Amino acid sequence: ATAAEAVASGSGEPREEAGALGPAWDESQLRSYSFPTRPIPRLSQSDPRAEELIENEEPVVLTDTNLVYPALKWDLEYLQENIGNGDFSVYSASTHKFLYYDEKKMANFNREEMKFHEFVEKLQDIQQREERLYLQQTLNDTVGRKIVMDFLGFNWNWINKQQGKRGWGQLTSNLLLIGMEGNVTPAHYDEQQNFFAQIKGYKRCILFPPDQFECLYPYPVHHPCDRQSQVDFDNPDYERFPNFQNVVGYETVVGPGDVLYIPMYWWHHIESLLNGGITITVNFWYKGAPTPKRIEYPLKAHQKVAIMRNIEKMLGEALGNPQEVGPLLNTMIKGRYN
Numbered sequence: 001a002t003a004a005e006a007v008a009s010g011s012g013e014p015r016e017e018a019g020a021l022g023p024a025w026d027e028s029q030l031r032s033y034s035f036p037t038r039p040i041p042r043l044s045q046s047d048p049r050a051e052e053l054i055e056n057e058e059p060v061v062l063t064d065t066n067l068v069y070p071a072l073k074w075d076l077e078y079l080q081e082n083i084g085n086g087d088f089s090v091y092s093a094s095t096h097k098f099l100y101y102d103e104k105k106m107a108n109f110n111r112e113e114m115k116f117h118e119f120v121e122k123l124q125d126i127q128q129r130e131e132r133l134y135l136q137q138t139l140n141d142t143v144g145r146k147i148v149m150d151f152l153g154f155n156w157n158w159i160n161k162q163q164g165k166r167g168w169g170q171l172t173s174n175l176l177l178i179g180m181e182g183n184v185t186p187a188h189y190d191e192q193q194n195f196f197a198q199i200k201g202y203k204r205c206i207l208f209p210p211d212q213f214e215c216l217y218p219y220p221v222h223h224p225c226d227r228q229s230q231v232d233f234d235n236p237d238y239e240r241f242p243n244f245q246n247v248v249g250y251e252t253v254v255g256p257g258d259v260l261y262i263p264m265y266w267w268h269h270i271e272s273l274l275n276g277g278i279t280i281t282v283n284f285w286y287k288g289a290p291t292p293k294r295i296e297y298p299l300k301a302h303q304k305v306a307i308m309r310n311i312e313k314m315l316g317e318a319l320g321n322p323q324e325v326g327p328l329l330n331t332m333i334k335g336r337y338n
C-alpha cells in the first residue's frame with residue numbers, strides 16, 4: 001500500500017521477441033507470492049553500470065555477453081545424441097517444490113543416477129502417462145565431441161576477465177540444469193559467486209540480499225537443509241516466521257542469452273515458468289576474493305552470516321553432538337540478551 005510508488009514493478013512488462021514473435025512470457029505464468037519485488041537491472045555488458053553492480057556484489061542481468069552462445073542450439077535431441085554415456089543426477093518431487101538434502105548431514109538428524117536417454121524417456125513417459133524431475137549434473141569429460149566443442153566456444157574472454165577484475169578464486173564447477181515447466185528451487189543461498197547462464201525457456205529468479213537473513217530463517221547449519229529457508233513461500237507461517245512479512249525481493253525473468261549474476265550469499269528462489277516448456281541453464285561457480293589481511297568495520301552482511309555459520313559449526317565440535325547446539329545457544333541468550 002501507500003508511499004504510492006510502483007518501484008514494486010517486479011520483473012516487469014514482458015519483453016517483445018524479435019521479428020514480432022509476440023510476448024516472450026505472460027504474467028499468468030508467474031507463481032503468486034506474499035511479498036513485494038523490485039527489478040534486477042538488465043544491462044549491456046558494455047554498460048559501466050553493470051561492472052559497477054558486479055564490483056559491488058549486487059545482482060545484474062547481462063543481456064548480450066554471448067557467454068554460452070554455442071549452447072543456444074541445445075535441446076533434448078541434440079543433448080541425448082552428444083552429452084555422452086555418463087551418469088546424470090536426477091531429482092524427483094511429488095510437489096512443485098524441490099527440496100534438497102545434504103547427504104553427509106543426514107547422519108546427524110530423491111536423487112537418482114541415470115543416463116541421459118533414461119532421463120529423456122522418464123520425461124518422454126510422464127507427458128504421455130503428476131511427477132516432476134530435475135536434472136542437475138555438473139559437467140565432465142564423459143561428454144562427447146560436439147558438447148566439448150560447444151563448450152570451447154563459450155565466451156571465456158569475458159568471464160576470465162570478470163574472474164580477474166573481481167579477484168575471485170577458481171572456477172569450481174559448471175552445472176547443467178534441465179527442469180520441467182513449473183519446477184521450483186526454493187529460497188537458499190550458495191557461498192560461491194555465480195554466473196547463471198540461461199539457454200532454453202524462461203526462469204523467474206527472486207533474490208534477496210544477505211541482510212535479510214533475519215527474514216528468511218535458514219535451517220540449522222547441521223541440518224540436511226542447511227542454507228535453505230524454513231519458510232514455505234506458498235504458505236508462510238507468520239507465527240514461526242514473523243519477519244517474513246518484511247521481506248523484499250529483487251526479481252527478474254531470464255531467457256536464452258541472458259546471464260544473471262547471483263552474488264555470493266544472495267538468497268535466490270528460481271522457478272521455471274508455468275506452461276513454459278523445459279528449461280535449460282548452465283551455472284558458472286567461482287570462489288569469492290580472499291578475506292583481506294585485517295578487517296574493516298562495519299562488517300558486510302555476508303561476513304556476519306559467515307560468523308554465525310562458524311559459531312554453529314564450532315559449537316557442534318565442542319559439544320560433541322550437533323543436536324546440543326540449540327539448547328546451549330538458548331540457555332545463552334534467554335533472559336540475558338533477548
Ligand SMILES: [Fe+3]
Nearest residue numbers: 188189190268
Ligand atoms: Fe543456488
